[PDB]
Amino acid sequence: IEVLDVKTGPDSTTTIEAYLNPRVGQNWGFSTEITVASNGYNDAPHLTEIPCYSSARISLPLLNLLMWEAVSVKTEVVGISSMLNMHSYGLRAFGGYGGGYTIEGSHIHFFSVGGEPLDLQGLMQNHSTQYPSPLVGPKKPDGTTDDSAQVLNPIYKAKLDKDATYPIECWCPDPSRNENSRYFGSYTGGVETPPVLSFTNTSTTILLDENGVGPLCKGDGLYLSSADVAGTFVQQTSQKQYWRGLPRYFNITLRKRAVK
Amino acid sequence: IEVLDVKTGPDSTTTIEAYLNPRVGQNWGFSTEITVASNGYNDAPHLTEIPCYSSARISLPLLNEDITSPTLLMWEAVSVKTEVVGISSMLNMHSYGLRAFGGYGGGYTIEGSHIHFFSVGGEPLDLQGLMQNHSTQYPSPLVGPKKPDGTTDDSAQVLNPIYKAKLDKDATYPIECWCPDPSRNENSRYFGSYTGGVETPPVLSFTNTSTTILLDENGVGPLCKGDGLYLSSADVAGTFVQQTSQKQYWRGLPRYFNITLRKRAVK
Amino acid sequence: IEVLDVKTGPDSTTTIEAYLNPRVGQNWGFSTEITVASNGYNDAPHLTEIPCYSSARISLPLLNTLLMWEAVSVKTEVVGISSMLNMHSYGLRAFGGYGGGYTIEGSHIHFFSVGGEPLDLQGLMQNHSTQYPSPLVGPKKPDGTTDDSAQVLNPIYKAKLDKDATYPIECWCPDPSRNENSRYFGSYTGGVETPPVLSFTNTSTTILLDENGVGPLCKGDGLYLSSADVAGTFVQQTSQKQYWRGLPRYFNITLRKRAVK
Amino acid sequence: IEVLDVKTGPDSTTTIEAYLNPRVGQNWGFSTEITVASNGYNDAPHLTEIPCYSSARISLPLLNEDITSPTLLMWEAVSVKTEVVGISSMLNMHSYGLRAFGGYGGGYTIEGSHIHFFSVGGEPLDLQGLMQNHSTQYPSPLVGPKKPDGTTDDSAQVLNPIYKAKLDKDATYPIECWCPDPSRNENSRYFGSYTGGVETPPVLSFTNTSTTILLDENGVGPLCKGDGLYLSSADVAGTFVQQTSQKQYWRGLPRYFNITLRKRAVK
Amino acid sequence: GGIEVLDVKTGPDSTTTIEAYLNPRVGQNWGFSTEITVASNGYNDAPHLTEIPCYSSARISLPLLNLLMWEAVSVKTEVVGISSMLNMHSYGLRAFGGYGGGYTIEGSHIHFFSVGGEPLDLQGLMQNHSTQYPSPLVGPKKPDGTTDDSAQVLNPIYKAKLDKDATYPIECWCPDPSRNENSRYFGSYTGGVETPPVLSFTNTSTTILLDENGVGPLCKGDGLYLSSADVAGTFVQQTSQKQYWRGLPRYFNITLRKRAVKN
Ligand SMILES: CC(=O)N[C@H]1[C@H]([C@H](O)[C@H](O)CO)O[C@@](O)(C(=O)O)C[C@@H]1O
Ligand SMILES: CC(=O)N[C@H]1[C@H]([C@H](O)[C@H](O)CO)O[C@@](O)(C(=O)O)C[C@@H]1O
Ligand SMILES: CC(=O)N[C@H]1[C@H]([C@H](O)[C@H](O)CO)O[C@@](O)(C(=O)O)C[C@@H]1O
Ligand SMILES: CC(=O)N[C@H]1[C@H]([C@H](O)[C@H](O)CO)O[C@@](O)(C(=O)O)C[C@@H]1O
Ligand SMILES: [Cl-]
Ligand SMILES: [Cl-]
Ligand SMILES: [Cl-]
Ligand SMILES: [Cl-]
Ligand SMILES: [Cl-]
Ligand SMILES: [Cl-]
Ligand SMILES: [Mg+2]
């Protein structure tokens, strides 16, 4: 798009409220138990134990030479306070006499705002991982997945076009594309790593680029994406781990922009 | 409310000092022992083991005293100096703490998962329901996320708009099933940080030189409806781990507020 | 005090160098062994195992509209941080006893205040029933009692930091409802084996002027310094006993003459 | 080179996209098992267990000397957008990792000592020799710090100027015996962070909103000699710990570059 | 210093740069101490010369000027060979019950540098007043030759000038904040048993050495005084489970300019 003047005047700005609920393998914020393939056997995790990118397309007011331009977003991880819970069946500290473990371990927090689906690059820890249908993993055109999927091979790309479909563990945001999307992510590893999350209604993220242009919403659609895996729940007795996801709130400010 | 000019002149600004004491299940800064339901049994924690949001409504000086005035005035919260009081209380290795280095060392200082949170507003803080276990049984008089029919389904573990409340009572709304609602609270400013982990060390700073500005993108602060300033607090520093019993108790700290307000005109 | 113009000209500014040595229960940077009361028995720690606020009043040049010294800025440093790079002085030994001694570790607090009067203290303690030996001073009501409310905020429990080595860190914090004429700065870190992180440079400066460009005004021509620098605990091999370790704080205050009504 | 005016006008700026895949001893993001010499035996690690600097020379558009102009033109690297690709790949607790909570929990995510480093330059990055063990035996075709006589003495464990190299070959210079030479690299900008520890969690961020400025104290960027832009990378995220074997493997990640260059005149 | 400072001479040959490196002095000269030893409770604390890390220090000769003094304006400094620590094969204590790789350098660490126009002023403070430092090391002594309990806190009687490389132990001397008017110093210490070192390296950082009044260190006797203390942590050896201090070299690049002075 050749970008022109910013239309100002009445009915020239609008806000969009939306939330994305987490897709950690089931719909209620927890995966099924995390399983580990035995050395030499297939790496074939259960559908319901594999966290995926949350994604939605919000319909914007119809315009027509004008496109909605995303200027800023207020975003928050909802239900952080839910984790201050040491009674709900957690593995017990101090030889079983203390309280249950709060959510801990490896976690990722990520959001994107765009005028089109987020561009994904294929990269995974184990090229041989078997993702059950209907999940989508990095495949060559011939249907195979070789060792190169553990590093950067441009052959492995996708568009984040379906909720609860693209596993976090084999797709990252493609930095060679996403010209019309703004994305932000932080991953922390470790076995018992404590989650650190902040929440305030005073933060704002500017979405304008080096040249003061925001994401331009093609087909009058605003594209939100989320991945908020706070860590794992560790259950007493079973000592099994479950991925715990949290919902993300969005508040996008858009304005009318003219295009050639 | 259509916001107008900021009235300046004498008696046009005022300060409010307040403190909120913590409500961690009892009134003296400690919960009763944290209990854990056995797998397959009801998750039914004791009233006195469940930390709640502290909350108060401070009465502000009367405004629309002048029966001739052409414009209504509301107090506008501009800035707050806030401090977590008694942080230094935690430098204590003699008061019955689980003992380090095979029992020959000093007692454990407060450690583990902690949350620190405050809000200033012109009305009660808007809460969204979200909890780790939808089936948790909160004893009366605590209030948890319920649908209109009285039930609580699996959706309460993620975002379902059906689960909302106003933080209208002290020591009543559990921290673990209510968070600030980011879809509302237009007339409140809230700030929170949570840290998880089993033995995580609390890190807290204290100074009388910090100030938090409460004005929004458009230079408007919280406007105090009914001449009431609404303070909220949640300062669970971590857990006390007791020697011998090896039981854990939530430890809360009080929060000090110093709000600067000014008169603002409204249509 | 109604504050007026800042007197400028010769002999209108001065600097004060001072150090506060730590008061961790003895005078040489270590407490006696930390003891823990048995559940159900009195919580009665030894005088020499309880760290206290360090405090001094520096005498300023006599001045006498009246003039008061105004504290503008302070360069401050925690002295002897490098002293902790020591793995040979009797520390509990790592890697099954074959490695070096534990460096100072565990819960620590670092705090300083500059003021024109004694620092205002608020009473708050972990255990209301703690018995502080004389001559230490703990939160008492006027009647001499100490109730459960001392574990949260009760305004009845206040004091002025008017004596060195007297006010325990564990039952007194800076009172944020007062200290209009003091500037205080403090950071506490908990944990059992938490590593201390301390920096030192002669390039840092802390401005002491308030929202209205007024610094602490030194009443009775006295500058009031306060310190609490408990770097952590020393863990001794064999005994596996813990001792509080304190460090001294250096102050360099710049003051200027200010007029008052 | 005497640096002159910045040529502006049409065809005077250009961008370069590139990626460097990691060289951790094999080409698919993992080393072979990390081995440890027995005390008193040779320190002789396998070729395929030794991570190396990734490196490439990107060809820039040829800049043709104008016999009427008084001044030659060189490409000047102004800014770089760079990202560590496939960070999200590490949120994997099913792919054969050593299992937590006595073997009943999920596999360990990548953890332990890690280094993240990138350089942009108008020539090969200048390397200084420094290694933990001077006696380490690097198999051919790797290149380690050698004196002219072929030996490597104790001084290679500190700074000896005799041990220098140019990062002129991919997958060749081990990270563990070469660092960026701060006494040179006038025409390169380099950025690195190392974290030690046994089980240290990696912390990595990713966004398409970050930019690193490459201009120096005097507003001059790397000047690309022979119309070549020199990229270097070292992104060892940590180790994979395998269940049962309890063997460790270095895990590398690819780095994306997006360099903005402009024409600069030189005497 | 006690020099009255005047105008900054500008013009040709009025600025110069100095490149230098200080190699670490952790008790031997090749980046490692001998094994760390621990006195038994009740016995003398008498560590080996070669197990005690010391401040690195050098005096660089500047071009002769004559009044004019060289003024240190800025320094680019870097800890060299950080990447050397990404080594899990060189005899380190082995992780995951001995089946994993060797421990990288870990534990308590200090990183420190100073630039000055004279030797760095040191204050005596030590963890154990009774520590016995072998000759030729220099520890805090009173004039009478003794060292009392006061050396564990601040006693002004215990001072020294960092006038010799590999001589002043880090563990009993810190920079004296009551002096060093003509030096700029910067240090960070981290404790703990297994604490991971975190070090960054870039040729884009610069540290300004000018004070509150835009005056840098003035190099007395046409000498620039560099000091370093970079103990990255300890090496933990498999089988022996003994610990060795590991030091790293520091690179300096100082920019100086001519400054005029009275008297
Ligand atoms: C990643 C993976 O391959 N998971 C597999 C698990 C793991 O072996 C468990 O960890 C056993 O504890 O076992 C299965 O039999 C199962 O539970 O259905 C098959 C499944 O494909
Ligand atoms: C969270 C919860 O449900 N707590 C329950 C506990 C836990 O199961 C104990 O930790 C093990 O008995 O048990 C009770 O008998 C109790 O102690 O009062 C009932 C209570 O409902
Ligand atoms: C660094 C080093 O010298 N490693 C040597 C190792 C290790 O001692 C063991 O693998 C212990 O893990 O032993 C070898 O037989 C091997 O595996 O190839 C030879 C190799 O040269
Ligand atoms: C700091 C110190 O005083 N170290 C002493 C050590 C340690 O006690 C042992 O290495 C640990 O048992 O013992 C010595 O015999 C030695 O190693 O030469 C004398 C030495 O003076
Ligand atoms: Cl939605
Ligand atoms: Cl009050
Ligand atoms: Cl208790
Ligand atoms: Cl906060
Ligand atoms: Cl501080
Ligand atoms: Cl593998
Ligand atoms: Mg009336």
Author numbering:
A (entry chain B): 24 to 87, 95 to 290
B (entry chain C), D (entry chain A): 24 to 290
C (entry chain D): 24 to 87, 94 to 290
E (entry chain E): 22 to 87, 95 to 291
Give excerpts from the publication.
Polyomaviruses are small double-stranded DNA (dsDNA) viruses with a circular genome of approximately 5,000 bp. All glycan-binding polyomaviruses analyzed to date engage oligosaccharide (glycan) structures featuring terminal sialic acids that in mammals are usually presented either on gangliosides, which are molecules composed of a glycosphingolipid, i.e., a ceramide and an oligosaccharide, or on glycoproteins, which contain mostly complex and branched oligosaccharides attached to amino acids during co- and posttranslational modification steps. These sialylated glycan structures interact with loop regions at the outer margin of the major capsid protein VP1, at the apical surface of the polyomavirus capsid, as revealed by X-ray crystallography and cryoelectron microscopy. The VP1 surface exhibits an astonishing plasticity, providing virus-specific interactions for a range of Neu5Ac linkage types and further specific characteristics of Neu5Ac-containing glycans.
In order to define the ligand binding properties of the three animal viruses ShPyV, GhPyV, and FiPyV, we conducted crystal soaking experiments with sialylated glycans, which yielded additional electron density for the glycan ligand so that we could solve and refine complex structures for ShPyV VP1 with 6′SLN and 3′SLN, GhPyV VP1 with 2-O-Me-Neu5Ac, and FiPyV VP1 with 2-O-Me-Neu5Ac to 1.6 Å, 1.65 Å, 1.95 Å, and 2.8 Å resolution, respectively. FiPyV VP1, which was also derivatized with 2-O-Me-Neu5Ac, forms interactions with Neu5Ac that are very similar to those observed in GhPyV and ShPyV VP1. The methyl group of the N-acetyl moiety reaches into a shallow groove formed by residues T58, V59, A60, D66, A67, P68, E72, and H117ccw. The N-acetyl amide is recognized by the hydroxyl group of T58. The R122ccw side chain interacts with the Neu5Ac glycerol moiety, contacting the hydroxyl groups of C-8 or C-9, depending on the VP1 chain. Residue H69 of the FiPyV VP1 contacts both the Neu5Ac carboxylate group and the E72 side chain, thereby providing for an additional hydrogen bond between the protein and the putative Neu5Ac-containing receptor. However, FiPyV did not hemagglutinate chicken or human erythrocytes, suggesting an alternative receptor specificity compared to that of the related viruses, likely influenced by residues surrounding the conserved BC2 loop Neu5Ac-binding site.
